[PDB]
Specification:
The protein is mainly beta. The chain has one domain: Cyclophilin-like (Cyclophilin), CATH 2.40.100. It is 12% helix and 34% strand. It contains two helices and 13 strands; from the N terminus they run E-E-H-E-E-E-E-E-E-E-E-H-E-E-E. The strands form three sheets. It has a nine-stranded antiparallel β-sheet. It is globular and about 40 Å long. This is Peptidyl-prolyl cis-trans isomerase B.
Length: 164
């Protein structure tokens, strides 16, 4: 189990270790070494998702480990409350950034091993604290640097608790 202790409340997450093995191992290693502590939710788009895990408060990007292979063909779908990996346009490029689906985003699911079909790998799900996720999706956002939909006031993951 993982808990995100944020400055808007606690979010409790269950991982799908069995369905996304490398992705969950990568996510938990960042969690266990303190990588997500003092990290923000840098991209908030109401009616779509909230994304975090890459930047500290003044949009300072943190150093990541090597990218992981896309495990999206695992039967899990981008439904409301699930966590999936963000990445670049290459399929096997995810490192530490994740997003939480705040609605069902079926357009993000795997449909084939191709640049447009690979989709986004679901690896976890919110079991407690979705009211907290719904407070964050509705915050006022703007532009920071070349980043759009950045919260005007920082939404910070202060600490992460990893429990079995």
């Amino acid at each position: 189990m993982v808990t995100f202790h944020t400055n808007h409340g606690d979010i409790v997450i269950k991982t799908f270790d069995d369905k996304a093995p490398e992705t969950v191992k990568n996510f938990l290693d960042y969690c266990r070494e303190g990588f997500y502590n003092n990290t923000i939710f840098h991209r908030v788009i109401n009616g779509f998702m909230i994304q975090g895990g890459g930047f500290e408060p003044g949009m300072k990007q943190k150093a990541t480990k090597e990218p992981i292979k896309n495990e999206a063909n695992n039967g899990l779908k981008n439904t409301r409350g699930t966590l999936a990996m963000a990445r670049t346009q290459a399929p096997h490029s995810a490192t530490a950034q994740f997003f939480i689906n705040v609605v069902d985003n079926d357009f993000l699911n795997f449909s084939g091993e191709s640049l447009q079909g690979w989709g986004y790998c679901v690896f976890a799900e919110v079991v407690d604290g979705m009211d907290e996720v719904d407070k964050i999706k509705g915050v006022a956002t703007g532009r920071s640097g070349m980043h759009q939909d950045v919260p005007k006031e920082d939404v910070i993951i202060e600490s992460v608790t990893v429990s079995e």
